[PDB]
Curated annotation (Swiss-Prot), chain A:
A single GO BP: cytoplasmic translation
Pfam families for this protein: Ribosomal_L2, Ribosomal_L2_C
Any one GO molecular function term: RNA binding
Protein name (record): Large ribosomal subunit protein uL2
Tree of life domain: Bacteria
Composition bias type Basic residues, residue spans: 254-271
Family: Belongs to the universal ribosomal protein uL2 family.
Complex and partners: Part of the 50S ribosomal subunit. Forms a bridge to the 30S subunit in the 70S ribosome.
Curated annotation (Swiss-Prot), chain B:
Molecular function via GO: rRNA binding; structural constituent of ribosome
Subunit structure of this chain's protein: Part of the 50S ribosomal subunit. Contacts protein L4.
GO (cellular component) term, any one: ribonucleoprotein complex
PANTHER family hit by this protein: LARGE RIBOSOMAL SUBUNIT PROTEIN BL34M, MITOCHONDRIAL RIBOSOMAL PROTEIN 34 FAMILY MEMBER
InterPro entries assigned to the protein according to its UniProt record, in alphabetical order: Ribosomal_bL34, Ribosomal_bL34_CS
Name of the protein in its database record: Large ribosomal subunit protein bL34
GO process annotations (BP): translation
Keywords tagged on the record: Ribonucleoprotein, Ribosomal protein, RNA-binding, rRNA-binding
Amino acid sequence: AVKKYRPYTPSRRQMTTADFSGLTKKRPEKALTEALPKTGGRNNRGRITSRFIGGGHKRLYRIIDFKRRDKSGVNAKVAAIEYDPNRSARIALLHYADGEKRYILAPEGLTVGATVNAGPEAEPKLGNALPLRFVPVGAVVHALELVPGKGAQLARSAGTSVQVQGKESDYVIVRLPSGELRRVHSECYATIGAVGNAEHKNIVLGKAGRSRWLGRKPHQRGSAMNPVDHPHGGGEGRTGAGRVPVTPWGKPTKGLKTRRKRKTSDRFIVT
Amino acid sequence: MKRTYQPNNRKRAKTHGFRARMKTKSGRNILARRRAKGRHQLTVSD
RNA sequence: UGAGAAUCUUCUUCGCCGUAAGGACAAGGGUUCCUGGGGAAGGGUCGUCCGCCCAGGGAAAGUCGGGACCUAAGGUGAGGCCGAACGGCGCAGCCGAUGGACAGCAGGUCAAGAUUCCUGCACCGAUCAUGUGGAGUGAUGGAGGGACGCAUUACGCUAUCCAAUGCCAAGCUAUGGCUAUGCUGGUUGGUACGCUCAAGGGCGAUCGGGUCAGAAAAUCUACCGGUCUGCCUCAGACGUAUCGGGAGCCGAAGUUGGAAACGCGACGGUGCCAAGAAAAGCUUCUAAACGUUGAAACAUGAUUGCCCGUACCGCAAACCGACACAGGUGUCCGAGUGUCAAUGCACUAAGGCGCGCGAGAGAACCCUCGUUAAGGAACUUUGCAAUCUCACCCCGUAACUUCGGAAGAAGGGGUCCCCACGCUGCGUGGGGCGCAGUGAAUAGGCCCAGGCGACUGUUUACCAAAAUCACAGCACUCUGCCAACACGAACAGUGGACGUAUAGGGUGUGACGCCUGCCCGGUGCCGGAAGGUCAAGUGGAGCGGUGCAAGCUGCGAAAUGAAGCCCCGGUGAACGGCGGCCUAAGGUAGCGAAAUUCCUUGUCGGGUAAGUUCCGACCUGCACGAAAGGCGUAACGAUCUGGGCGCUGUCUCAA
RNA sequence: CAGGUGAGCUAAGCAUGACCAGGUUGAAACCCCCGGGGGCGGAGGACCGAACCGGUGCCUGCUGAAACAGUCUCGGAUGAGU
Ligand SMILES: [Mg+2]
Ligand SMILES: [Mg+2]
Ligand SMILES: [Mg+2]
Ligand SMILES: [Mg+2]
Ligand SMILES: [Mg+2]
Ligand SMILES: [Mg+2]
Ligand SMILES: [Mg+2]
Ligand SMILES: [Mg+2]
Ligand SMILES: [Mg+2]
Ligand SMILES: [Mg+2]
Ligand SMILES: [Mg+2]
Ligand SMILES: [Mg+2]
Ligand SMILES: [Mg+2]
Ligand SMILES: [Mg+2]
Ligand SMILES: [Mg+2]
Ligand SMILES: [Mg+2]
Ligand SMILES: [Mg+2]
Ligand SMILES: [Mg+2]
Ligand SMILES: [Mg+2]
Ligand SMILES: [Mg+2]
Ligand SMILES: [Mg+2]
Ligand SMILES: [Mg+2]
Ligand SMILES: [Mg+2]
Ligand SMILES: [Mg+2]
Ligand SMILES: [Mg+2]
Ligand SMILES: [Mg+2]
Ligand SMILES: [Mg+2]
Ligand SMILES: [Mg+2]
Ligand SMILES: [Mg+2]
Ligand SMILES: [Mg+2]
Ligand SMILES: [Mg+2]
Ligand SMILES: [Mg+2]
Ligand SMILES: [Mg+2]
Ligand SMILES: [Mg+2]
Ligand SMILES: [Mg+2]
Ligand SMILES: [Mg+2]
Ligand SMILES: [Mg+2]
Ligand SMILES: [Mg+2]
Ligand SMILES: [Mg+2]
Ligand SMILES: [Mg+2]
Ligand SMILES: [Mg+2]
Ligand SMILES: [Mg+2]
Ligand SMILES: [Mg+2]
Ligand SMILES: [Mg+2]
Ligand SMILES: [Mg+2]
Ligand SMILES: [Mg+2]
Ligand SMILES: [Mg+2]
Ligand SMILES: [Mg+2]
Ligand SMILES: [Mg+2]
Ligand SMILES: [Mg+2]
Ligand SMILES: [Mg+2]
Ligand SMILES: [Mg+2]
Ligand SMILES: [Mg+2]
Ligand SMILES: [Mg+2]
Ligand SMILES: [Mg+2]
Ligand SMILES: [Mg+2]
Ligand SMILES: [Mg+2]
Ligand SMILES: [Mg+2]
Ligand SMILES: [Mg+2]
Ligand SMILES: [Mg+2]
Ligand SMILES: [Mg+2]
Ligand SMILES: [Mg+2]
Ligand SMILES: [Mg+2]
Ligand SMILES: [Mg+2]
Ligand SMILES: [Mg+2]
Ligand SMILES: [Mg+2]
Ligand SMILES: [Mg+2]
Ligand SMILES: [Mg+2]
Ligand SMILES: [Mg+2]
Ligand SMILES: [Mg+2]
Ligand SMILES: [Mg+2]
Ligand SMILES: [Mg+2]
Ligand SMILES: [Mg+2]
Ligand SMILES: [Mg+2]
Ligand SMILES: [Mg+2]
Ligand SMILES: [Mg+2]
């Protein structure tokens, strides 16, 4: 039920915009928004690093709880799902029995006011934070830790899901959104189910600047650069030869990972 | 038709100023190089 | 005036700007300000004058701006992380306004200062005293709050401007008239007090429970349960008083109707998605500590009020342009008449100015212009330029289409003055005047048909704005999180990213539609990894010296040694190739004399009297072709090409 | 080639403030009559046009008024804006 438009303007017909009806229209939470994002592409020395990051709308951070481990054994009521910049996923406010308010990722479904139970012994309801050991095999889960503590690092974009597979003495295999079959420690927490706002992916931008509103400066082809600025140099017409990037390499097929100790910690099936 | 020199006092002294030059070995070199040449001015501080 | 005057002073006309060419600020300049004097040089001429030379004055703050407060980016930075050196980072803290915070307004005036000084009357904090009160204060820590987007938009109101036979003030007038109902000018600012009128705006309120929340505390917050329109508020108006100001010859009047802000009420409503600082001041809590018969607080009196800035120029003759420079320069205010509206256009108030050589004369030629017989694009690379079109209202508008548009298509009609009538300035009738009625100024030429690019946009400061670049959309490909990727003396630190595969990086195509064929041989890459080859290293069998010898010592194989290359598959939205009377293949659709056609003015048709151009077919494609994308596409273009209408001194041919 | 000086012009980023007369068009959504008509509403890298931003074509200027401008004409003008 994404919003559409008639073509009253040349670039309005192809645009798409997300359905905000279920989001609660409210201010983010004054304590949970430490705010202060510098929003610079320039890095520690003022030299451009991730190229083409540019202006766009100013945002604030709102702190999100990724570990979800200090509240073990405590129930939480879902105050209000609400919008958030800097995430493909919508987030849910939740109030704890001791009265602490805290933010979390929103799973698919989860109507406002649903109870949620963090901890070891909490049941595989939607929204609970669980160790991999108590999770039944094959269930949809997101917000997955790579290490105990730290916090969730896997599955956190909108609509991503992780699949438990088999189990070892401690380590539990899971299917990553790439389809990678990676092992993960039993004590890692996860949130059951898929992430909310499942169909972010179909939004159509519909005009140039609308990505500027996202802070993405125009991305030049190196087909246009002079040979000074890119290995696709001049050439009096238009082409390419050899297929290499900015600093030269292979963008079509080249293995790029290194020879880390991580490689033995996953079954080789990948992407 | 805008010209090269838009004066600005805080900019003129934040760059170029004696305290600014003293922060850096190059600027202390500028200072002694001027004292040796014997200029009356030495900096935009004067 | 003066030695000397077109230019200096004054007077009276004149003309010129008036969302400025008026006024106030910020910069930034630095005495350019005022007074008296001067005349070398600077002033594009003069000069008795000046922004020039000389001398002397002017510049006043508890409340305005900053500081004795706070924080953003940024810069620092004891400790700390690194690094041939110099140094590079770096948590807290600190600096750092462009932002947050905060106590006065009305009037007067030196030649030259003004929310500063003087006058009237306020406020602020601090100390102390008198008294009420006569006890709780209540932290570098907790909590609230401060705290924020955009577009629209309802109601009240002010600033402020308009009208009048409202008031007030002063005098005339005459030309032909008006004797004022004519003319001109003025027609309130602050403060205090109201059983005065007032839209709009804010706010629910305690009792209790739980520890797992705010470090612990907490009577303050958060969570959780139980409990019953009203308050507060003045924007602003009105009255009384008072203190000012007030046209004017010391001091009059201060009315009625209307208009109306971006300003005020307010932190209003509503809609939207791109989801819109921090921090102290401030309100509320306890910790520690100090007391609880000299509290918190309040009232009055008194006392204290530091530093820096303030002159003048400040869209420019005082700043940036080497100049008294046609250039630029951020913010604020910017009246009236008319014209749908307006900061537009024309005239003008206030205010400000005529641009620091002048005077003649009315040749050629040159620059900006006005009119032009007849003809009308014949001119020319091209209608380049100059006409023509011109605002508002009514009627009417195609092929095509993505159904929104093309569209202001095209085309026609009205437009002024008076009177009666109807409705809330319009419409209805009638009359009138001219050549002419958006009467002067501002104010679209339009149509048909191509090529290219979908589109808004972006660009070569100063010869190129386009068909370039970017763009949404698509595709390949990588990257499992100290992510790939990049800056970097660096196991430093950062960016990616306080993001985590619906995300991030790169590459190329470039909305939308139908689509995107053949060829893994080379090159790249991804897999395999029976075998070929391959470094140091492990090994040291043997070949030699030199010693009487022990021994020392120079070489030194075989085998065994990784990645990698040779080898074997595959991969094209990888680099590419898809032709010359064997190569891995040899052109699927679509198009074709192209932006690609050499021969070339190809042939036929179209359009013109005449067509190297142009359009449609044909195909013999020198030398098209499928995401270095192929074929289309509505809409779009200061884009290029061809045509036609319209009107024009582009032209016959110039006056 | 070395070590410096320069982002006060200009090329971008960041923090924080500010600016964009007026008129035209009338998207959703919401509400009635049967996707169509009416109302209502006020959306847009919408239209026209001042500031402002920009430089499209001729001409003038060419020991300039100006070391890149001037008259006239033209592009945008709530957005990828200044
Ligand atoms: Mg792209
Ligand atoms: Mg180039
Ligand atoms: Mg290169
Ligand atoms: Mg190249
Ligand atoms: Mg080429
Ligand atoms: Mg690179
Ligand atoms: Mg210059
Ligand atoms: Mg000094
Ligand atoms: Mg005399
Ligand atoms: Mg003389
Ligand atoms: Mg006289
Ligand atoms: Mg002025
Ligand atoms: Mg100054
Ligand atoms: Mg003077
Ligand atoms: Mg004088
Ligand atoms: Mg003289
Ligand atoms: Mg002279
Ligand atoms: Mg004079
Ligand atoms: Mg002072
Ligand atoms: Mg005073
Ligand atoms: Mg202050
Ligand atoms: Mg540092
Ligand atoms: Mg600061
Ligand atoms: Mg300020
Ligand atoms: Mg104040
Ligand atoms: Mg006096
Ligand atoms: Mg004065
Ligand atoms: Mg606005
Ligand atoms: Mg009258
Ligand atoms: Mg208390
Ligand atoms: Mg303004
Ligand atoms: Mg502080
Ligand atoms: Mg002054
Ligand atoms: Mg001064
Ligand atoms: Mg010059
Ligand atoms: Mg000038
Ligand atoms: Mg005005
Ligand atoms: Mg006006
Ligand atoms: Mg008017
Ligand atoms: Mg005007
Ligand atoms: Mg002046
Ligand atoms: Mg004059
Ligand atoms: Mg002319
Ligand atoms: Mg004629
Ligand atoms: Mg004709
Ligand atoms: Mg001819
Ligand atoms: Mg022509
Ligand atoms: Mg041409
Ligand atoms: Mg023309
Ligand atoms: Mg049809
Ligand atoms: Mg239609
Ligand atoms: Mg028309
Ligand atoms: Mg007549
Ligand atoms: Mg008529
Ligand atoms: Mg007229
Ligand atoms: Mg005229
Ligand atoms: Mg284009
Ligand atoms: Mg446009
Ligand atoms: Mg150029
Ligand atoms: Mg040009
Ligand atoms: Mg590290
Ligand atoms: Mg391309
Ligand atoms: Mg031909
Ligand atoms: Mg052709
Ligand atoms: Mg083509
Ligand atoms: Mg022919
Ligand atoms: Mg043809
Ligand atoms: Mg291709
Ligand atoms: Mg193309
Ligand atoms: Mg068009
Ligand atoms: Mg354009
Ligand atoms: Mg033509
Ligand atoms: Mg627009
Ligand atoms: Mg149009
Ligand atoms: Mg430009
Ligand atoms: Mg136009």
